[PDB]
């Protein structure tokens, strides 16, 4: 009666949905043709509600009515010190309502609306739901959904509630690092094994030490940095090009938030290309004052601008090993997770840290969590 159940990675920055079909996990592309979807919502002045790529890609000078980063607020109270810190950096309004940080926005024509963070995530979940239904050709009603291993009782319940709002029965909440391990068939291993999961995404860096003992996972320790991710690498590159643009002209880009957002979208794309190529062209017609932008970024310059942030990832790996009473030698499996682990330098740094030990390979790191959830959803489907 559960039909075809879906596996959903609900990411801070990008979400992914898979399903088990004809004996194999399929990761599903959304209606813009992408296998990941921005965890973003926007509201046009005409009152259209946009979700995903359409919402992130919308140029506007009104960043107040775009909503993202709801995973930082979900399941948490208004007065939670972490909420109070995060709202300093968010461009949308957050207000105390019913003990919680509600998001307040203009929904169209000056009509204000407030949304609990789970109602925001419910919109993202609706989008993932729609993505799977278009693929399957039928309605979907049940889901496996992942959360970071450190999520507490309230954050897990609020993720289920988001499902409920979206019409999804969330049958199982699984930990993200565990789903990635499952994607790589690591639960099948025989005896006891120590697994380090290094997960570097868009907004966050999570390191997890897991133990597997005949198909039973244990989260032994977690560490990382909740404000370190792919978005931070983008910002270093933006700073670089804004600085260069000023010097080469005399103009300061930053007065035009449409211009900044244009450069952001393009810098993001180039960074992705530099995981595959050694140079990438950034170009924006009518960039600033109707003047056109064209520059090139090398992989080497990308690495140089970010090297300190890249190296900073090793400290939490050290701490995790310490708190687990383990040394590097005690690690039997290394699992790379998150879109930022596609960056060659990040893969090089992790390998060197583990004295040349190769990590698991073969599943896209930004899809491995969804893949593991789909693996479980396949058993639950029938
Ligand atoms: N090929 C690539 N090369 C470099 N970066 C990439 C590549 N592909 C995706 N990314 C980045 O991966 C980041 C998103 O990672 P992803 O794991 O998909 O997000 P998430 O699941 O929301 N993780 P999180 O933001 O930490 O909650 C974004 O900053 C992307 O720009």
**Contact between residue 127 and residue 30 where contact means Cβ atoms under 8 Å apart:** yes
Distance CA 338, CA 356 (A): 21
Distance CA 153, CA 248 (A): 53
Q: Do domains 1-67+124-188+361-382 and 189-228+313-360 have the same CATH topology?
A: yes
**Contact between residue 354 and residue 323 where contact means Cβ atoms under 8 Å apart:** no
Q: Is the CB of 378 under 6 A from ligand 1?
A: no
Does 276 show up as a binding residue in the annotation?
no
What resolution in angstrom units was achieved for this structure?
Answer: 2.0
User: What is the domain partition of the chain in residue ranges?
Assistant: 1-67+124-188+361-382, 68-123, 189-228+313-360, 229-312
CA of 11 relative to ligand 1 center, distance in Å: 9
Determine the residue of 71, 236, 339 to mutate for testing ligand 1's pocket, defined as the one with the most ligand atoms within 8 A of the Cβ atom: 339
CA of 337 relative to ligand 1 center, distance in Å: 9
Pick the CATH number of 68-123 from 3.30.30.30, 3.30.70.60, 3.20.20.70, 3.30.210.10: 3.30.30.30
User: Of 241, 236, 246, 256, which Cα lies nearest the Cα of 310?
Assistant: 236
Going by alpha carbons, the residue nearest to atom 5 of ligand 1 is 340
Distance CA 361, CA 363 (A): 6
Q: How was this structure determined?
A: X-ray
Question: Is 9 annotated as catalytic?
Answer: yes
Contacts 24+ apart (CB under 8 A), 110-118: 111/47, 115/67, 117/70, 117/71, 117/73, 117/74, 117/75, 117/76, 117/158, 118/70, 118/74, 118/75, 118/158, 118/159, 118/161, 118/162, 118/165
Question: Is 176 annotated as catalytic?
Answer: yes
Report CA 73 to chain centroid distance, whole Å.
Answer: 15
User: What is the residue-wise DSSP string for 67-111?
Assistant: E--GGGTTT--TT-HHHHHHHHH-SSEEEEETTEEEEEEE-STT-
CA of 339 relative to ligand 1 center, distance in Å: 3
Does 11 show up as a binding residue in the annotation?
yes
Distance CA 60, CA 172 (A): 38
Pick the CATH number of 1-67+124-188+361-382 from 3.40.50.1000, 3.30.420.40, 3.50.50.60, 3.40.50.720: 3.30.420.40
DSSP H or E stretch at residue 288? strand 279-288
**Contact between residue 67 and residue 42 where contact means Cβ atoms under 8 Å apart:** yes
């Amino acid at each position: 009666d559960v039909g075809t159940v879906v596996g959903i990675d609900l990411g801070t920055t990008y979400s992914c949905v898979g399903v088990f079909k004809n004996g194999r996990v399929e990761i599903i592309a959304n209606d813009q043709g992408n296998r990941i979807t921005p965890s973003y919502v926007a509201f046009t002045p005409e009152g259209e509600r946009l979700i995903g790529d359409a919402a992130k890609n919308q140029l506007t000078s009104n960043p107040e009515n775009t909503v993202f980063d709801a995973k930082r607020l979900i399941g948490r109270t208004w007065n939670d010190p972490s909420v109070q810190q995060d709202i300093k950096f968010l461009p949308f309004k957050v207000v105390e309502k019913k003990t919680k940080p509600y998001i307040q926005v203009d929904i169209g024509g000056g009509q204000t609306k407030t949304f609990a963070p789970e109602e925001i995530s419910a919109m993202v979940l609706t989008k993932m739901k729609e993505t799977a239904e278009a693929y399957l050709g039928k309605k979907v009603t049940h889901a496996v959904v992942t959360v970071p291993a450190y999520f507490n009782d309230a954050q897990r319940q609020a993720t289920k509630d988001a499902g409920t709002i979206a019409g999804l029965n969330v049958m199982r909440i699984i930990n993200e690092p565990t789903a990635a391990a499952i994607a790589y068939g690591l639960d099948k291993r025989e005896g006891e094994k120590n697994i380090l999961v290094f997960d570097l995404g868009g907004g966050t860096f999570d390191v997890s030490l897991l133990t597997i003992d005949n198909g039973v996972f244990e989260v032994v320790a977690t560490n990382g940095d909740t404000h370190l991710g792919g978005e931070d690498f983008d910002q270093r590159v933006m700073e670089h090009f804004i600085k260069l643009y000023k010097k080469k002209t005399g103009k300061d880009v930053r007065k035009d938030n449409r211009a900044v957002q244009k450069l952001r979208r393009e810098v993001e794309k180039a960074k992705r290309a530099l995981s595959s190529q050694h140079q990438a062209r950034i170009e924006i017609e009518s960039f600033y004052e109707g003047e056109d932008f064209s520059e090139t970024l090398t992989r080497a310059k990308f690495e140089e601008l970010n090297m300190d942030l890249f190296r900073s990832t090793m400290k939490p790996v050290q701490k995790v090993l310490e708190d687990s009473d383990l040394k590097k030698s005690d690690i039997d499996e290394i699992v790379l997770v998150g879109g930022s682990t596609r960056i060659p330098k990040i893969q090089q740094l992790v390998k060197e840290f583990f004295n040349g030990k190769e990590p698991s390979r073969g599943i896209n790191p930004d899809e491995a969590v969804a893949y593991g959830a789909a693996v479980q959803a396949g058993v639950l489907s029938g």
